[PDB]
Amino acid sequence: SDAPPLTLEAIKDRVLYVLKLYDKIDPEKLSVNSHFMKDLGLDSLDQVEIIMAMEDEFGFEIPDIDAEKLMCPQEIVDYIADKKDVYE
Amino acid sequence: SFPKYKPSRLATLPATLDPAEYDISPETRKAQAERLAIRSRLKREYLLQYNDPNRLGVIEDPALIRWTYARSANIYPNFRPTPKTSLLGALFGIGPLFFWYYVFKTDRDKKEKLIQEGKLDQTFNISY
Amino acid sequence: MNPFASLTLTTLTILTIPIMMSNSNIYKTNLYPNYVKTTVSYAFTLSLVPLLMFM
Amino acid sequence: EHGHSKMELPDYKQWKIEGTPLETVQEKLAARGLRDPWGRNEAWRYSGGFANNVSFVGALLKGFKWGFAAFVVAVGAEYYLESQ
Amino acid sequence: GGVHIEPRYRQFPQLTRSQLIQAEFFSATMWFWILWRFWHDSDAVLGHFPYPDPSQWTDEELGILPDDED
Amino acid sequence: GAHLARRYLGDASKEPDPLRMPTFPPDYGFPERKEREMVATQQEMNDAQLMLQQRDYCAHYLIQLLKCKRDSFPNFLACKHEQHDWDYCEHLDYVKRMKEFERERRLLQRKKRREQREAEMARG
Amino acid sequence: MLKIIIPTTMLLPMTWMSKHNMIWINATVHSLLISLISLSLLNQLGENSLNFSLTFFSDSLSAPLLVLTTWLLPLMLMASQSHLSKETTTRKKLYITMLILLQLFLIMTFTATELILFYILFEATLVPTLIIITRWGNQTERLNAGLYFLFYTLAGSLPLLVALVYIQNTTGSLNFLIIHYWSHPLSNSWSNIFMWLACIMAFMVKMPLYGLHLWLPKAHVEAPIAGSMVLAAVLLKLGGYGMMRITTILNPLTNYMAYPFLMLSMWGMIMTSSICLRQTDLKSLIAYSSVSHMALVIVAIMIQTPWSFMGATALMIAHGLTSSMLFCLANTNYERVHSRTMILARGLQTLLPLMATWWLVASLTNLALPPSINLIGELFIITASFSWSNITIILMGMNMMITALYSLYMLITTQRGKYTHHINNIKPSFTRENALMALHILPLLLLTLNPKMILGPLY
Amino acid sequence: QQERDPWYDWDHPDLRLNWGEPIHWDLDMYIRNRVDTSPTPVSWNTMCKHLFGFVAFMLFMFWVGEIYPSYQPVGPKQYPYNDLYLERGGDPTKEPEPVVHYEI
Amino acid sequence: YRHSIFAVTHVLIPVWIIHYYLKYHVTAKPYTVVERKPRIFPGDTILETGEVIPLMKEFPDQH
Amino acid sequence: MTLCLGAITTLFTALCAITQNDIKKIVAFSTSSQLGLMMVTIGINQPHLAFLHICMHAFFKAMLFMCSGSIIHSLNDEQDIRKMGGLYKAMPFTTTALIIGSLALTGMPYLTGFYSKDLIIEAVNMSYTNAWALLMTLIATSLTAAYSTRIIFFAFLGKPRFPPLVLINENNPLLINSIKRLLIGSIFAGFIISNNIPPMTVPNTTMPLYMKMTALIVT
Amino acid sequence: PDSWDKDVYPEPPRRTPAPAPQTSLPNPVTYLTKIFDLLVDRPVTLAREFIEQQHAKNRYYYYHREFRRVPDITECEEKDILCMFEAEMQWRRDYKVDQEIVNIIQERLKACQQREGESYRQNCAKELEQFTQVSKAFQDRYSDLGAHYSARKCLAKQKQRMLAERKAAKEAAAA
Amino acid sequence: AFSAPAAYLTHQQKVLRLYKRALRHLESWCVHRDKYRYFACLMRARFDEHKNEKDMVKATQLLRQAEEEFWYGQHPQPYIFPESPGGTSYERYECYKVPEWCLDDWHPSEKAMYPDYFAKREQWKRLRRESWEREVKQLQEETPPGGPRTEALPPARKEGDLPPLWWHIVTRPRERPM
Numbered sequence A: 001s002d003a004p005p006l007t008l009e010a011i012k013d014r015v016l017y018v019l020k021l022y023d024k025i026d027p028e029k030l031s032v033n034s035h036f037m038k039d040l041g042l043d044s045l046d047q048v049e050i051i052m053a054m055e056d057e058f059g060f061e062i063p064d065i066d067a068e069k070l071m072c073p074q075e076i077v078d079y080i081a082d083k084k085d086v087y088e
Numbered sequence B: 001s002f003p004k005y006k007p008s009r010l011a012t013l014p015a016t017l018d019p020a021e022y023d024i025s026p027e028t029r030k031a032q033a034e035r036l037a038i039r040s041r042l043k044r045e046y047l048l049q050y051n052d053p054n055r056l057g058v059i060e061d062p063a064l065i066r067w068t069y070a071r072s073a074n075i076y077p078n079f080r081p082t083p084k085t086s087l088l089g090a091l092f093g094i095g096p097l098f099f100w101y102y103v104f105k106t107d108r109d110k111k112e113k114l115i116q117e118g119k120l121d122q123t124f125n126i127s128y
Numbered sequence C: 001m002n003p004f005a006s007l008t009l010t011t012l013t014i015l016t017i018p019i020m021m022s023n024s025n026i027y028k029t030n031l032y033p034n035y036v037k038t039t040v041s042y043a044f045t046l047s048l049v050p051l052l053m054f055m
Numbered sequence D: 001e002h003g004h005s006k007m008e009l010p011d012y013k014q015w016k017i018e019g020t021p022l023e024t025v026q027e028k029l030a031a032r033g034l035r036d037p038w039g040r041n042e043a044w045r046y047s048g049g050f051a052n053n054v055s056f057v058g059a060l061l062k063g064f065k066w067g068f069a070a071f072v073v074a075v076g077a078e079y080y081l082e083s084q
Numbered sequence E: 001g002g003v004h005i006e007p008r009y010r011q012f013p014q015l016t017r018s019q020l021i022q023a024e025f026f027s028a029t030m031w032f033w034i035l036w037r038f039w040h041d042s043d044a045v046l047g048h049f050p051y052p053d054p055s056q057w058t059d060e061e062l063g064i065l066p067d068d069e070d
Numbered sequence F: 001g002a003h004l005a006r007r008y009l010g011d012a013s014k015e016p017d018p019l020r021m022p023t024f025p026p027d028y029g030f031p032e033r034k035e036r037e038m039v040a041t042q043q044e045m046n047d048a049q050l051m052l053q054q055r056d057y058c059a060h061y062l063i064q065l066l067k068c069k070r071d072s073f074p075n076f077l078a079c080k081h082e083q084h085d086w087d088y089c090e091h092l093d094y095v096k097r098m099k100e101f102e103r104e105r106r107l108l109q110r111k112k113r114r115e116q117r118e119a120e121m122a123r124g
Numbered sequence G: 001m002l003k004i005i006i007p008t009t010m011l012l013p014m015t016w017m018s019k020h021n022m023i024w025i026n027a028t029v030h031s032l033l034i035s036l037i038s039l040s041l042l043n044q045l046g047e048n049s050l051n052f053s054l055t056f057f058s059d060s061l062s063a064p065l066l067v068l069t070t071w072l073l074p075l076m077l078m079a080s081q082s083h084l085s086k087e088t089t090t091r092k093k094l095y096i097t098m099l100i101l102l103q104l105f106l107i108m109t110f111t112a113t114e115l116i117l118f119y120i121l122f123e124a125t126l127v128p129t130l131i132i133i134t135r136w137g138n139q140t141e142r143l144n145a146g147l148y149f150l151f152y153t154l155a156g157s158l159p160l161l162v163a164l165v166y167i168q169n170t171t172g173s174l175n176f177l178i179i180h181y182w183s184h185p186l187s188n189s190w191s192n193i194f195m196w197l198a199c200i201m202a203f204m205v206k207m208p209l210y211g212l213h214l215w216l217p218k219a220h221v222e223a224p225i226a227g228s229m230v231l232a233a234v235l236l237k238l239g240g241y242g243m244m245r246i247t248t249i250l251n252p253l254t255n256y257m258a259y260p261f262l263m264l265s266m267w268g269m270i271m272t273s274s275i276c277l278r279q280t281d282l283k284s285l286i287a288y289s290s291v292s293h294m295a296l297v298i299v300a301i302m303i304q305t306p307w308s309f310m311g312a313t314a315l316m317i318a319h320g321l322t323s324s325m326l327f328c329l330a331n332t333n334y335e336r337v338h339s340r341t342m343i344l345a346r347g348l349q350t351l352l353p354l355m356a357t358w359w360l361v362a363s364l365t366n367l368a369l370p371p372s373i374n375l376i377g378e379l380f381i382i383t384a385s386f387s388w389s390n391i392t393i394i395l396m397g398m399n400m401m402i403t404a405l406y407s408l409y410m411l412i413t414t415q416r417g418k419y420t421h422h423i424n425n426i427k428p429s430f431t432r433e434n435a436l437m438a439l440h441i442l443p444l445l446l447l448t449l450n451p452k453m454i455l456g457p458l459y
Numbered sequence H: 001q002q003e004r005d006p007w008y009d010w011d012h013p014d015l016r017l018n019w020g021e022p023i024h025w026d027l028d029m030y031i032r033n034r035v036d037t038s039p040t041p042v043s044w045n046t047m048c049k050h051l052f053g054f055v056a057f058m059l060f061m062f063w064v065g066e067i068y069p070s071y072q073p074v075g076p077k078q079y080p081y082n083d084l085y086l087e088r089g090g091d092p093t094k095e096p097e098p099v100v101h102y103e104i
Numbered sequence I: 001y002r003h004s005i006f007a008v009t010h011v012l013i014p015v016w017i018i019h020y021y022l023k024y025h026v027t028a029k030p031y032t033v034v035e036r037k038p039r040i041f042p043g044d045t046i047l048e049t050g051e052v053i054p055l056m057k058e059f060p061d062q063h
Numbered sequence J: 001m002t003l004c005l006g007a008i009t010t011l012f013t014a015l016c017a018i019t020q021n022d023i024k025k026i027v028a029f030s031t032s033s034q035l036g037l038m039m040v041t042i043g044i045n046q047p048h049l050a051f052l053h054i055c056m057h058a059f060f061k062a063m064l065f066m067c068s069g070s071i072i073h074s075l076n077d078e079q080d081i082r083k084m085g086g087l088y089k090a091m092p093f094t095t096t097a098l099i100i101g102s103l104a105l106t107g108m109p110y111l112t113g114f115y116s117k118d119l120i121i122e123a124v125n126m127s128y129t130n131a132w133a134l135l136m137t138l139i140a141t142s143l144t145a146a147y148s149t150r151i152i153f154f155a156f157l158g159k160p161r162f163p164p165l166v167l168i169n170e171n172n173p174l175l176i177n178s179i180k181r182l183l184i185g186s187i188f189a190g191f192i193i194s195n196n197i198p199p200m201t202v203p204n205t206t207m208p209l210y211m212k213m214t215a216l217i218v219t
Numbered sequence K: 001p002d003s004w005d006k007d008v009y010p011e012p013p014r015r016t017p018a019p020a021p022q023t024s025l026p027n028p029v030t031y032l033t034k035i036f037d038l039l040v041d042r043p044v045t046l047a048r049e050f051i052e053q054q055h056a057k058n059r060y061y062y063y064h065r066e067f068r069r070v071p072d073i074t075e076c077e078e079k080d081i082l083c084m085f086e087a088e089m090q091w092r093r094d095y096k097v098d099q100e101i102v103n104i105i106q107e108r109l110k111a112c113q114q115r116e117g118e119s120y121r122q123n124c125a126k127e128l129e130q131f132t133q134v135s136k137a138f139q140d141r142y143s144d145l146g147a148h149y150s151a152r153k154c155l156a157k158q159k160q161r162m163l164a165e166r167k168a169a170k171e172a173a174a175a
Numbered sequence L: 001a002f003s004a005p006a007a008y009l010t011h012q013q014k015v016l017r018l019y020k021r022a023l024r025h026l027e028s029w030c031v032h033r034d035k036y037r038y039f040a041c042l043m044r045a046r047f048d049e050h051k052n053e054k055d056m057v058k059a060t061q062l063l064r065q066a067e068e069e070f071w072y073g074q075h076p077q078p079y080i081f082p083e084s085p086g087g088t089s090y091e092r093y094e095c096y097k098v099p100e101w102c103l104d105d106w107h108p109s110e111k112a113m114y115p116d117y118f119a120k121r122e123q124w125k126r127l128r129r130e131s132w133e134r135e136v137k138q139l140q141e142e143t144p145p146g147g148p149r150t151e152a153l154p155p156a157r158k159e160g161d162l163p164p165l166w167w168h169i170v171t172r173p174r175e176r177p178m
């Protein structure tokens, strides 16, 4: 392995980095608590694209039943944190 | 238009291509709710017995006991001599014995005849 | 006499020494893999000689 | 001793589609009236040291230059030593 | 065993000159070996004896008599 | 391969059979029939214990090659001349085999033409 | 021979008059001493035998069986220590008395110069075993099991008695040495056919032959641990030993009459090995494995070649040790889970690593891994069968494939995978259990160094 | 049991069974260690057709290649001493029929 | 130092044991160690007899 | 029967390999095809030649597997060639080691696989064999070259495809030394062992120029 | 070595060619043999000489047993049990002797092949004839008796064989 | 895994699952990133051609030929993540997950090492012992008559409470315990 011990700060940085590279979202309006369907006005499909982007970025696949109830960047951060058991 | 998929015994139809699943009905909707109901009730029972700090044993599972009892002990009292059972038993229990008897008798008759006529070339055959 | 036989058997025989020592204290530490690799290297170097004799 | 030194991410502005084969896909998509919202996300695969690519035959001949130099110097040395 | 090298996150990872020189040297020795062998012994691939043409043999050595003798 | 295509596509009897070679007397060509000479006698070849398929007419060169490799051991690039002579003798044997094959082929052509001409004469 | 018989008898007053808490210790130490003393029986001759007296004699066929019988008792005591703890001291002493009686009867069975004395003791081993099954059993069905184990056995042996007596009235003696020297051929006749059947079917039912085997899974499954050990290890070998002893008078009718039993055993091994693949119980699986191996032994004995007899003896001893070990392992699991189901408790290798290595060794030996004496017996029997007829190899090889398959299935289902979440009473393995398995396995891998001691009189 | 949902929170994740439900009569035949009846990317009958066709074609062509062997325009290899009589089988006391090899 | 003590305890001692066993016990019994007879080529000298084998038949040497 | 079985095995297994995505599966089918080739060699009555092929296959196949393992561990336990992109420059020693291994396995002249596989093909070509097995042996040679090309192209040439967090590292003496020993082997051992051992087969001296080079042409 | 007999296990004179290197360059084999000798053979030989002197300090004997000749089954009364028993034991000992004779011939044959190397097909023909002779003799004498072999069955087999031989000879003579 | 399933999948859920599977198999088919991006935008456009669609019979007539078109071009060897239920490392670290209760069987010599951990473990055990007596009553009160209808559990509603049946969710072994 020899993999670095990534933390919550790294997680949230990577989440916000991946969401910024999404051209459909202005980087000024999206914040860690920015809801997807209402604050950003994104379609359900584009939520699926976001989920798949986070999949390919983090190397593990999220079950769609858990994925479709991921609507906030903080929710995704916490889901990935709980899956991969990060302390701080 | 695409070539179609034909299910078999060992290649079961997928859920996504089951025609019945797509065509939902009111009766079916009610049925699904009750299936999840019994499943959730059993899960709740198992979790109540599972999280108990006092319990230091195995949670007895009636379904596993029923499975084992039906597989082992429940066969004979429900057995009934039926043309199907009689024919299958006769075949699978007698045919193999007589087929192998025929094969081995044929081989050994041939071999003993070859020995008696002396045309076998059994040289060096010391262990037996 | 005739070192060929002695070497051709001793290479195989020293191939088994770490298995003998597997119940010792070296096993419980982290020097076991180094031990096994060093033993295999020695065994190969030692087995080279009979090949030279045959050649 | 592990790799714990608080590694830093790049800036998300540094990724540009310019100079990548994502111009071809963007042009073909707009030629039909479509856009790829994630085109910038893959930019890092064509930005840095990954910009330059090598052909298959360029892959096979990893060390042909040094091998050829050594081979010719060896032939010269043997030619001058044998012809004595 | 080796040196401490850090992950780099979406850029070309750090490479020491040591492994690059080792890879280049081994590629160089591989190619040098091929051309050394080809120059010194080219017979292994191309062959070094000629293949006779069976139609070139005249009938005098094949024991062929002109249709009438035997 | 061409001979394969010719035999499996042309007349089966026109080309020889490699299993039944030769099908003609060795004296059919000419009455001289000089004999092949083997150099290695039985004892020095058996004492050499080369192999049962290496005990051909080119065995003496093989014996010289083995002597070479046993004597000048530490360098395995010492002697290519004996290997060259052995390889040349093997090529000469193989060429003699080709000559035999083509000889039987052309003799079969001759016999076919002779029988056909005689049968045509009997036809007229 | 009485130097072996008398001490085991003296065990009875020893265990009865011992302290309430020192019965197990005394029984274990003195049984081990008797094993050591009986080890002297191993030195044999290439000539006829060692004749102790008019009534007791030993042979290099009786020697390994006697040694194994004497060696078993300490392990049976170690195995039955656990589940008898809550029992009153009087009943524990009764249990020990049953075990000692069984050992004593088997010891007199295996020497038994005369056939009637052998029969009396061969049937006397019935009562202690039946009481052990029907009294210290757990499930309801133990009682049913008992009846089967009785009547089947008697159903086979009651004609034999008549047969034996009839022989004494025409030959004049049943002494084994005389019967060996004064043997005469059996002419093909209906009377001789029925004498042969009466003499053989008594031992066939105990091997047990396929078709007459139905009592074995029930007896092994419902018996206590010690009952299972003694049934699998030694009591099955009574039939094979008896057939080896009695086929000296049945020639040349055996060449003609072996076909129904050779076909039954050759096909029976395939069927029982296949049944082992689909089983919901550990003890049932091991019982059917015993059925398969004993069918192979039956084939060897009916082939009647020196290689057949050597391989049969080796397989008998090796399977006795293997089956005892496997039943012990299944019982260690049963004491913790109290369910006796293969699927129930899984992933035990992560929890009990040494029990996992014991499982690996036991299954490897049952799989007939070389150079273990299991493979010696299997290979010699296969070779003799191939000499008999070139077509037996397909059946033998099919059996080999299936036995490997189900042995590894038994290993993987219980040891490998993910543990059962809801089972949290799986305590570390005691010293007693590991010592039990070690004392099971060490003699096997030690005898593979000196095969001649177990290859029988025709070595 | 292979086609059961692998992302459910089963009580026995390895077995893919929930505590309490009725157990299939043949569970010990489908345990993810044994026969799996999953749907397949190609219909079963198409699988059988293609595999059997490939096997039969290969067997027929191997027989054909056997009936039409390949070789080179060469006569048989020649061995010096009566086709190497003494050191193949031996029997030195029979004087085999002399065979003499033609020099061409 | 570690490799010296290693080679002493792991190569020297086992090879001593095997060399003893072979040269005094295994070779004590007949036919236990059978060696392929060394190859014999013309012109060689034998240590036991000192006899020099005859050379070959002087084949024609061209090319 | 041995010749036919080796031929069908090598053909079918190389054909299966030609289109795999797991790198370990590709090299597994590669070794199975090599075993089939060796069985073909036994079938044509050339056992010593098959042993030499065993000896060379050991070196280069083992080092191919070690290179694949280095790649797998480097990219956070990944095996699909669809997720390794440009590794020519990211890890140079693994790249060059697997390139030399692919050239050796494909019978590039004057490598470790040349002295064995080339003689295998020369021996089968000039022997009284089945035509079909000869055809399948040649086709299997071509397919071996093709799936080697597949490994190189899909693992090293294109643009990267792995997850953004790069963890590629080779700076470890253990892996480097273990690879370089087998590299020296797969370069020079073929020559050393071929020229050192006494000859055990009659050489294939005379041979048509076109059937001489058919191995190089088909590769 | 006198530890065994050189006539029951015959060996060729073991002719070995003297080394005649044609190359100026030195080999590693001679140096390796020299270091192996000085590093292994010398300590081994010293330990053996110590052990041998210790053995010679305490010298004592053991003997090989002799068995007299007793009537065989062909001179046995039909129902007498003592003489039948003695004949049976003697027949068993002769059986074991015969097995060891066949084992001796087999050891000779295996050694012959291994030594002759690639010329085994010719040089070992004499050993093959010896083994075929002994194998044929052993087979007639002991094969086809069964697991419960005995002296009586061997005699019965021999009697049947001699009846058949006599019938064949009488038919052949008078035809 | 975390969330309890619902009684059925509505049409939107089937839409999204088919869309995701089609996109994954498309990425598996088109290895290169640019080509996959091209065909993914093409697929999204072809998918939203009938986004605004109104009636449901024609909607379920679609996503039925879509299923067949998917099952015809599904790439029988798709890319699977290493830790996924098909991945090459699916249950690889499952042999190292040891249940926590095994620690209760450690010899006192073993427990002498790591004393602080066992102090904290005893604290956790007491916490669970009290919280269980609270949780049983919270569940018997909160549960509708006739047993639960969905395998969903309620959270803690008071101050000193903890979620019902929390012990075996917080005490997972680890993702990579060893």
Ligand SMILES: CCCCCCCCCCCCCCCCC[C@@H](O)O[C@H](CO[C@H](O)CCCCCCCCCCCCCCC)COP(=O)(O)OCC[N+](C)(C)C
Pocket: G003, G036, G037, G039, G040
């Ligand atoms: C360096 C050592 C190598 C070899 C090791 C040998 C080990 C010896 C012990 C193991 C042998 C087991 C005993 C097997 C034979 C005993 C049965 C019988 O055959 O022997 C008896 C005699 O044997 C001995 O008397 C008794 C053997 C008892 C062995 C016990 C040794 C270990 C005991 C340790 C006890 C622990 C101490 C207390 C702990 C609390 C009767 O023979 P006997 O009729 O008379 O002699 C006749 C000979 N004549 C006619 C020629 C004159």
Ligand SMILES: CCCCCCCC/C=C\CCCCCCCC(=O)O[C@H](COC(=O)CCCCCCC/C=C/CCCCCCCC)COP(=O)(O)OCCN
Pocket: G152, G153, G155, G156, G157, G159, G162, G163, G166, G191, G192, G194, G195, G196, G197, G198, G201, G202, G205, G212
């Ligand atoms: C688990 C159940 C197993 C059952 C075991 C019993 C089956 C064994 C077969 C029958 C046993 C009884 C046979 C009699 C005992 C031997 C006596 C004997 O050999 O003497 C015979 C006597 O022969 C008999 O008495 C035979 C009578 C048989 C009666 C019972 C028959 C039972 C059915 C047998 C046929 C089936 C065979 C297979 C049995 C299958 C059982 C499952 C010779 O008669 P003499 O008077 O001496 O003649 C000399 C003057 N001419």
Ligand SMILES: CCCCCCCCCCCC(=O)SCCNC(=O)CCNC(=O)[C@H](O)C(C)(C)COP(=O)(O)O
Pocket: A043, A044, A045, A046, L012, L015, L022, L025, L026, L029, L046, L047, L048, L050, L051, L052, L053, L059, L060, L062, L063, L064, L066, L067, L069, L070, L071, L073, L074
């Ligand atoms: C390469 C392998 C073959 C793969 C082929 C793949 C199949 C391609 C063909 C696809 C055909 C179809 O889309 S079948 C069309 C099925 N019917 C509909 O899509 C209309 C109703 N859909 C909705 O209302 C959703 O909610 C929606 C608005 C979409 C989003 O919801 P959100 O607002 O909550 O995000």
